[PDB]
Amino acid sequence: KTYTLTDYLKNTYRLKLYSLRWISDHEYLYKQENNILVFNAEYGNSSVFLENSTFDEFGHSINDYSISPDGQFILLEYNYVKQWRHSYTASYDIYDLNKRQLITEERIPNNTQWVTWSPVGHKLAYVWNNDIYVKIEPNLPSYRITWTGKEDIIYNGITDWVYEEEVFSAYSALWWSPNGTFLAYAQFNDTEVPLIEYSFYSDESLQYPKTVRVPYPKAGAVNPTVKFFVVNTDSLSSVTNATSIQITAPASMLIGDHYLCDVTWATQERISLQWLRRIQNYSVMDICDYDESSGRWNCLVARQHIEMSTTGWVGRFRPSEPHFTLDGNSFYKIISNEEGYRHICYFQIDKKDCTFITKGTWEVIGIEALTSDYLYYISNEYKGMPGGRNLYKIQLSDYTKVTCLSCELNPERCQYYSVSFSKEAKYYQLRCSGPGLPLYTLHSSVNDKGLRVLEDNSALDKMLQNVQMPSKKLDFIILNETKFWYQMILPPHFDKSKKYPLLLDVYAGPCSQKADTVFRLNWATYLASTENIIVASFDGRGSGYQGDKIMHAINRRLGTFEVEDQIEAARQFSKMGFVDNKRIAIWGWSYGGYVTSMVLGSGSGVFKCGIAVAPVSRWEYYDSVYTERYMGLPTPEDNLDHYRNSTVMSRAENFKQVEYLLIHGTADDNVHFQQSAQISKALVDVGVDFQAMWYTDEDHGIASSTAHQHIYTHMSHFIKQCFS
Amino acid sequence: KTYTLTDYLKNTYRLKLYSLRWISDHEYLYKQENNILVFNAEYGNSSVFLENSTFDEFGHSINDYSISPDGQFILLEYNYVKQWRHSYTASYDIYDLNKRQLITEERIPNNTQWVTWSPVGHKLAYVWNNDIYVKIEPNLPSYRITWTGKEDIIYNGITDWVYEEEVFSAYSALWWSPNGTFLAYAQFNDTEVPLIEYSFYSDESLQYPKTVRVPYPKAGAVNPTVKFFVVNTDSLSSVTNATSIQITAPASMLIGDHYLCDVTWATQERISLQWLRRIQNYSVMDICDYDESSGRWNCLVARQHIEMSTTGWVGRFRPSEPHFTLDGNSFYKIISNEEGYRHICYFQIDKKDCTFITKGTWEVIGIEALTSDYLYYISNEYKGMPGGRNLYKIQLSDYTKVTCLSCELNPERCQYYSVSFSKEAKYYQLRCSGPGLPLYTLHSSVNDKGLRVLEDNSALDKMLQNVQMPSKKLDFIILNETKFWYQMILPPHFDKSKKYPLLLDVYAGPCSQKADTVFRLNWATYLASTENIIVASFDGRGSGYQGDKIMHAINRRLGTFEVEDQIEAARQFSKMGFVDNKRIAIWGWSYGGYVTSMVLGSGSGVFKCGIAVAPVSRWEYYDSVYTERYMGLPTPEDNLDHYRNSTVMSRAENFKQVEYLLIHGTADDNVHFQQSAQISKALVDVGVDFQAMWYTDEDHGIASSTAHQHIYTHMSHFIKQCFS
Ligand SMILES: Cc1cccc(-c2cn(CC[C@H](N)Cc3cc(F)c(F)cc3F)nn2)c1
């Protein structure tokens, strides 16, 4: 027997996670059956912290919970209702743990946009009708910090669409100070930002389709504007509209259009900000101190740091976040060095220069933890593989004393690690994601002994010995004087002498990685396992984690190299001779659907067919923060030329040579139906036949249970047919 | 060689028309090459009336012309820009024929909604920004009759969406009196009518899709309201806002929601109106006289005639129009008699009863002309075939003296006639549409001698002897004690002993006729001629021209009998044994996409596959005037039950048994994309795979040159594949 489509769609073979949240420097919470336990890492003893039956009469299905850091209250999120990618609304009840009662006085209102405890104690900040509210005690009246909030226009403590998706990667635009004194929050004015309008159809009952209106800046459109504020949460008059002290931006930003692009507190009275120019090659960091006499905030022009690039844009998707030392007089931050590799730079608050505390022909991925002794960072250094991911520690007193904590823990089973440290970094969890089965283990920082194995998925391991799994090959090939990685999913019993049909699975977007050591059970597993199809991927130019020379190659050039390298990557898989070069296909979502579409439109004749799911078809239709970061402005002085030269529509003719399946969700707020509807029109105009499928009311994920099954079923038929 | 798809899509074999407009009782205008001639029917001589080169320096491509009845001016329509089905906007220049100059003073404004001469002389009424304007002389200032016009809200002299499509079948809501004294006009208030909102995507250039908003009453929603007015076009103060004398409705109408449903002038000072209840089983005619002393209008309660039905709705799609005798004291009107057959009733203005001047088991189609001696009517009496159409005359002095003027003119070539009479009915054109090649001939009423053959399409006839045409069989079958007509397009050399694959071509709507004697060169021609496929059609219950017993069968029952009869019709075609009963398909547009969808969802297992093009999926989504005319109100007291029991969505499951192609234009204002999008969602919910195709910016006709070709190409592959 074999890994079938239903196996994938019905999820018959489960991967197991181990999901914990650290509540102290030695205690974390795990959920079990329905009980919330608390595992003491020190001894190993675990205690029922909350019992499955504690909420049987609660009367509502509970979507999420949040426990106040001081263990005194638990937040109960129910009535969840997704909005965009990270945003949603909900209702909230607070339960008193000291007692055993749900607070009925001054409750958090229905339809709340965001909720959060202070990092210490049990204060609540919560946004509602676009306005911030603070609650020092669960049962007491709430101090309404903001008054200006207005639907689709003013955003207080929450991001508008473009800031949510493309900048902060969350819905929440607020930030407590490390002890809970100050509530930093940002403000978004969307007044002159244009609306995207699309239909929502709803239940068959709904007689007129709703029109959905979203402030969405397409490329070169009018952006939102931001203002930043800080509030003292202590001095809160039960009888005066609280004073929000605005920090303004540097004057190098205030000349032109800008985005606030990071908010990191350093100390109890020192906050750092990072600003980005609308042209995203120039960033500025500010450090703002609290002047205890004036109640104001002061950002010294001598404490400013500038980050800029000449070969492309600043950061991977934004500038990295700083990691301040206990005192808050120095920080660590990832930057690309002179050779273009993202490493750790050591900064003194008021010194313009930094010191690199790593270098190499590889990249730091992220700074994970910082003690007085150690900085922990994840990097793809080990075995020189960029698809890999490991935990290291560097000695703060000695920059040449680097230990790899994970490299050797299980060499064969484990090459992709992520880490979760406890408060003050006493203990850490290591998550292994491949190439073997996921493996979750606990560790103490002190001497690095492996206390316990929390999850090894042996349960699944048993189940899979009965199933003909595909194998995964990860390797590289040299194109110029650069090595480019690829990965194949090989059908079980892979006979290198036969000729297999290949499916080129595509993303390709700037700073992507589709070739890694991760263990996945997805659609490709089924395509190899059962249909004996090689599903390949290739991280050519534009892609991440291999230094700026590669990643910035597509600067102001989207839809060129990344596209051509994908074709090349296919030519080469044919030169390996286990590939039926008359049955090569291509497929992709989001950016990858664009690249898929661009490829079929190239008339390279390498490819028989392709599926583009929710593709971008023309950069001008995509949002500004993303598009511009790579292409600049679409005016004839900036880059309007490459904008006009890189559409799927102009390659319409060549589709005559291919079989094409274009699939789009009608209620995609992210890559709007328009992109796909302009392609279809284009093809129809030049008399190209193709295949289409819309998905009513689906968004960019086409992720509803039934549509997920439908789309994948539909694509399989398409692929099968295409390949006989 | 054979009739191929391209032959149909590139229109290589042309049918020729003969398009003339009568300007007198003996002269008509024909266009030739680019010259407008005038053929005198009296002698036969023809003269250049306007020369092809008269407008070479005109500077604009001329979409249409209109010549004033008194030969003095010609109206020049250019910059045409389609709106809905009949509606559009344009610009207009007026050219003086007496002289040779384009009037430059007081020109008709850009973006005019409607324009028309008075029936006599050369006055102009023209609607613009929703308001009426009169012009007694081309060069003189225009008297603005209305002031209340407002976009999407107030319609003066033009119909709103639902009145255009479903009532008057034109854009123009105005009516001159027979000599040009009075301008009758209607007014539409759409204030509380709900909007349909859909996207338009436009040229690739357009960066945000436009949202299109249209006042559109779905079933049971708030209807537009109407008021009627008459103006004296002579007494027009170059210094006073002209007085519009409102006629109001009967009081039997004013109790509830109503529509104005006909406007026929009787004499120079007597206008007739017809009113319809929102429940469309009750009509009332009014006759309104001009009181020369009061300047008012008076509709005598004794001159009212009531039209109503108990077994269904009044009229075929509306009540028929009256035909008033010279004096205006009697009129002729078509009504169904006691046995349910539409015949001519003779009415005296103030007498409640009428006299039937025809009876039979067949129907009058329309009253074409009326003299002091004769009434001319078209009917399907000849050979007892309802798919036929003939010209007859009845003697006004003797109701038993009926002559058929066409029946015998060419029995084999000619069984479908239409007629165009000259002023006072001195001469007429006969248009033969099948079953042979279209034949256009001229005739004098006086003794009925056939002056000349104007067009015989012998040019095409030559061309087609070289091509393997399909033959067409029209016949009937008995189901209960009723005979139901069907037609087959049979592949050339049709061997009755073989087993052919059949495609059931569906419309099926209330009062439809898909089985007739007409000669067509369409898609079916290609399917039979080249793919040797039988393309059948069948007019079962609900269908027109065979009396109320059949047509009213579906009253309050849409999506039942008409649907079941179509399945039946296919069972029976299998019993004829030349049909491969494992390769039967079904297809349909508009209503027929609905019926096609209902059938596949019936699980009758007769049908392998089907194509539904722009179907209705649920009656509550279609406009009110149509839907209600057949189903009543969708409230639980009226008919909400049949409404909820007749959706395509509830048959979702059964689609498992079929192969389905659903095709819809995104910018369909008539059957909104919602209808299709609710189907696709329904199918995806029960995990049925199917095939889809949207058409960017196309409407209900998918009729742009490139989309037309694309859709039909696409459906062919589908059909071919479905049939191997
Ligand atoms: C692994 C990792 C870590 C942190 C940030 C990110 C990340 C990923 N992204 C992508 C955001 C962007 N909206 C993706 C996107 C690209 C398209 F081209 C498109 F059409 C739609 C998209 F959502 N931004 N930041 C990824």
Ligand SMILES: Cc1cccc(-c2cn(CC[C@H](N)Cc3cc(F)c(F)cc3F)nn2)c1
């Ligand atoms: C031959 C002839 C003479 C006069 C009027 C008409 C006539 C034809 N029609 C059809 C109009 C109707 N809206 C068609 C239609 C039906 C549907 F069910 C639908 F979903 C969409 C449509 F356009 N109404 N009146 C036909």
